[PDB]
């Protein structure tokens, strides 16, 4: 059971590669994005195909394939 490469795109339109396992949590991916982008976890949330990614669920539950594009969304404070 080996990892695969997905893409996360930030507010500016830049896609970066991330080696993930479908068994890892969304929270674990959010930590990878936080490290690469330099933004804390509670400042953004992730969407795939217009659906939010729940932190405690595994990535395999969203049908991510190699080079799938996940979107980084700023988490507003109102």
């Amino acid at each position: 059971m080996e990892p695969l490469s997905i893409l996360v795109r930030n507010n500016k339109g830049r896609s970066s590669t991330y080696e993930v396992r479908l068994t890892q949590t969304v929270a674990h991916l959010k930590q990878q994005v936080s490290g690469l982008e330099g933004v804390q976890d509670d400042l953004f949330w992730l969407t795939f195909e217009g659906k939010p990614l729940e932190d405690q669920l595994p990535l395999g539950e969203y049908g991510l394939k190699p080079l799938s594009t996940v979107f980084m969304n700023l988490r507003l404070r109102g």
Partner: protein
């Protein structure tokens, strides 16, 4: 001397624990709630003798799976957060504004007003999790304390802090289901890989984060394919009882004179790099009803930053 207490997570299964009156509940058992109040840091006495307590810390193996049965697959911190959040929002109030209920402003809960008032318009939804569906029915009956606290617990919202109405609204709907049929069909193609149709049904065909108009939802999209080429995707069929589209704050001129197609929307006031303010708006009788945390005012025209937009039912087929 010593008291016997009934410990429960579900209200129908109980475990007996005998405690002394020498140490607090927290040291002998864990954090406990009695009639909605936290009594973990008090010493047990005879007033709680023979009474049921709602335990949050140090759940047993059986109580944990009863917890997953009631609340879904939640983390160990969940029960403590929900019980504490529920008694923290005890003073909050749902105020009637122009025949509908709105959350009065308290402790930066304006984002919750946008979420709840938007949910109140979706009158065809149901929650699969029993505790969430129960709190939802209690909310629609007039008692919203449970629903508010559960929503904040599932959303990882910290009390008294601002948050994101769009994120919370779509996170809640991910736990819901539609009581009628709905369907959206995407067509995806790549000049090397070929063409394929993707079908979604139910409530998932009614929410989308990324666009804020139906025209943008129906436009062609292009992005890198697994082969390295350019892949395309385009909506080809859409039948829903309503449609919720959300995106970043986008300044628009909402106007009655043109009679727009959406029925409700949320507004973020302020700049997005800073703490702002949410308003929930609805179109009724040729005016925009602006629900600002227990107050309501009406305008025919409003320049505002739109986030969530609620459209009516969709009947669409293309190509």
């Amino acid at each position: 001397l010593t008291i016997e207490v009934l410990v429960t997570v579900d209200g129908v299964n109980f475990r007996t624990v005998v405690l002394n009156n020498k140490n607090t509940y927290r040291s002998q058992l864990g954090c406990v709630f009695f009639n909605g109040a936290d009594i973990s840091d008090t010493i047990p006495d005879e007033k709680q003798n023979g009474h049921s307590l709602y335990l949050a810390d140090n759940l047993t193996a059986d109580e944990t799976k009863a917890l997953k049965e009631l609340y879904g697959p939640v983390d160990p911190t969940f029960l403590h957060r929900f019980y504490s959040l529920k008694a923290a929002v005890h003073g909050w109030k749902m105020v009637v504004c122009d025949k509908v209920r709105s959350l009065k402003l308290s402790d930066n809960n304006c984002y919750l007003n946008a979420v709840i008032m938007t949910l109140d318009l979706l009158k065809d939804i149901k929650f699969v999790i029993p505790a969430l569906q129960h709190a939802f029915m209690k909310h629609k009956g007039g008692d919203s304390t449970d629903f508010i606290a559960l929503i904040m617990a599932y959303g990882n919202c910290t009390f008294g802090a601002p948050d994101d109405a769009s994120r919370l609204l779509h996170t809640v709907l991910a736990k819901a289901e539609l009581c009628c049929s709905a369907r959206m069909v995407w067509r995806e193609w790549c000049n090397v890989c070929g063409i394929k149709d993707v079908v979604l049904q139910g409530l998932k065909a009614c929410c989308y984060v990324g666009v804020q108009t139906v025209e943008d939802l129906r436009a062609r999209m292009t992005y890198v394919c697994q082969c390295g080429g350019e892949r395309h995707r385009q909506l080809v069929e859409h039948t829903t009882p309503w449609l919720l589209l959300s995106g970043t704050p986008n300044e628009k001129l909402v106007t009655t004179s043109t009679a727009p197609d959406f029925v409700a929307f949320n507004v973020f006031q302020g700049i997005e790099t800073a703490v702002g303010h949410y308003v929930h708006a609805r179109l009724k009788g040729g005016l925009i009803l602006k629900f600002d945390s227990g107050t309501v005012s009406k305008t025919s025209d409003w320049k505002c930053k739109v986030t969530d937009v609620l459209f009516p039912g969709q009947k669409y087929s293309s190509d």
